[PDB]
From Swiss-Prot:
The gene is B3GALT5. It is found in: Golgi apparatus membrane. This is Beta-1,3-galactosyltransferase 5. GO terms for biological process: lipid metabolic process; oligosaccharide biosynthetic process; protein glycosylation; protein O-linked glycosylation; response to bacterium. It comes from Homo sapiens. The keyword Transport does not apply. Belongs to the glycosyltransferase 31 family. Expressed in stomach, jejunum, colon, pancreas, small intestine, testis and gastrointestinal and pancreatic cancer cell lines. Hardly detected in lung, liver, adrenal gland and peripheral blood leukocytes. It is a single-pass type II membrane protein.
Amino acid sequence: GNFLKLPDTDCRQTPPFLVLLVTSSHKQLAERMAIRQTWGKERMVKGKQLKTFFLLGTTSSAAETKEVDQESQRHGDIIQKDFLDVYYNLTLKTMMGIEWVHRFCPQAAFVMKTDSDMFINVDYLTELLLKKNRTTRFFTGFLKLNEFPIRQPFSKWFVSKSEYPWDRYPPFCSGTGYVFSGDVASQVYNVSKSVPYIKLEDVFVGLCLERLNIRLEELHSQPTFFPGGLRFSVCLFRRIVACHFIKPRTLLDYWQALENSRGEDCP
Ligand SMILES: O=c1ccn([C@@H]2O[C@H](COP(=O)(O)OP(=O)(O)O[C@H]3O[C@H](CO)[C@H](O)[C@H](O)[C@H]3F)[C@@H](O)[C@H]2O)c(=O)[nH]1
Ligand SMILES: *[C@@H]1O[C@H](CO)[C@@H](O[C@@H]2O[C@H](CO)[C@@H](O)[C@H](O)[C@H]2NC(C)=O)[C@H](O)[C@H]1NC(C)=O
Ligand SMILES: *[C@@H]1O[C@H](CO[C@@H]2O[C@@H](C)[C@@H](O)[C@@H](O)[C@@H]2O)[C@@H](O)[C@H](O)[C@H]1NC(C)=O
Ligand SMILES: [Mn+2]
């Protein structure tokens, strides 16, 4: 597949239950370390294997290139291909992750694509997945069902009419954190080259899923994915899956809060 880096893992031997694919740019080492030390730490979650990998492209900076080469040697959890790692190449990054699942870990029961500014509660996500009885053609997150493309030309999410020419986006889930049954990876990889390209990765996956006739589903009767962010509380964060707008220092503090309060009761 032309990968420059591949994690030292053998999903055929020990099929993981949940694989996290985490986006971050080259310079965001602090984010990756905070995640490695918090919700990204590999472990058994109620007897289910969690695995964690970081998606990276390449950069012009020789310094950053060397940093990441050393980081990969030290941690062995980086998936990398040769594409310029910039915001408007996130679609390639996401497709890299999906291609990796397809080529090297099709045995994963579930895959979560997520970002580096996030708190993820893997314990509660795993509980909710074990309760869904949905093991195939499954895709969930924060559902965005009738979104309109942003035409304000200086907006971070602006797309011109030539980039995306229609009035509404397909159904899709926030790229902040979405989850799917491992089989979906192969399906999306397969239809990817046939679907109109768009620089917003979450919209692009939405296009792929629509072509595949895979409908988006809510994970639970209550909201569990929060792209808008949330006021922090131990009891609230025990019963959510994903929360956005979390910088590394904050992530470490929240993780410590949950450890300090382990084994209290919540209403
Ligand atoms: O060059 C980069 C720049 C950013 N990122 C990572 O991409 C994610 C999203 O970047 P931002 O948090 O700066 O912006 P935003 O929250 O608006 O991104 C949103 O819009 C994007 C459209 O591609 C994605 O869908 C994304 O998941 C979704 F959250 C982050 O994890 C960031 O670390 C990279 O990997 N490489
Ligand atoms: C997305 O990454 C691709 C691949 O690195 C970029 O395309 C290359 O652009 C460089 C200059 O940045 C050229 O030297 C190469 O010839 C291009 N090759 C390919 C594969 O097209 C592309 O510019 C990046 N996208 C953005 C928006 O920066
Ligand atoms: C999933 O199923 C749970 C118990 O499942 C048993 O086997 C499944 C496959 C069904 O046939 C079910 O009728 C059986 O009792 C349920 O307790 C649980 O609520 C289900 N999850 C859902 C629907 O959210
Ligand atoms: Mn973000």
